[PDB]
Write an enzyme that holds these catalytic residues in place. Sequence first.
Site, short mmCIF file in Angstrom:
data_model
loop_
_atom_site.label_atom_id
_atom_site.label_comp_id
_atom_site.label_asym_id
_atom_site.label_seq_id
_atom_site.Cartn_x
_atom_site.Cartn_y
_atom_site.Cartn_z
N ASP A 1 41.29 41.15 41.47
CA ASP A 1 41.68 41.14 40.03
C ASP A 1 41.63 39.75 39.42
OD1 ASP A 1 42.30 44.03 39.43
OD2 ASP A 1 43.81 43.60 40.98
N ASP B 1 39.53 37.23 46.53
CA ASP B 1 40.41 38.06 45.74
C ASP B 1 39.61 38.93 44.73
OD1 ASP B 1 43.24 38.66 44.36
OD2 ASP B 1 42.06 37.62 42.85
#
Length: 181
Positions: A20, A18
């Site tokens: 953010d 991932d």
Amino acid sequence: LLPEVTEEDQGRICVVIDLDETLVHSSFKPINNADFIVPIEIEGTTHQVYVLKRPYVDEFLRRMGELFECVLFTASLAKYADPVTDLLDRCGVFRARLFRESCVFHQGCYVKDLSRLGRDLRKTLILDNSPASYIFHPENAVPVQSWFDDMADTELLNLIPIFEELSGAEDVYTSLGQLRA
Ligand SMILES: [Mg+2]
């Protein structure tokens, strides 16, 4: 969902990562501190996005690229995630980039359904600060603390030996079990 594995990735575990708050932290608030500024045109108007890189992400990503088939899988929109990853991934580590639309929608969460990926789940990991991304596969998860602006973070440094230990496993469910042992 993912391209056929390459010659070089052939026997490697696939690690979904991932963006953010795992590798970077972004904001619309100007800061002088920022590693990247990226212009994003919003409802046809243009917004500067200020991005801080997490400590060690560059060395973390480089090592990962030597050991695993690394994928970026984010629930954010491509118009944001593509320029930010282009600047973040300065060594070309990601073999593929999946965005909001490859996620499944689970009443309001976007889940990263690892079984849509086209890889052996016994040879797949996911690195993500949101347990909601991995609702369907928490047993493949390697959780990581959210990051925002703490320049003293060493979480990616701490995790390098962890993935170094994992990288040769034939079944991640056994390996994560012995790591936690
Ligand atoms: Mg996240």
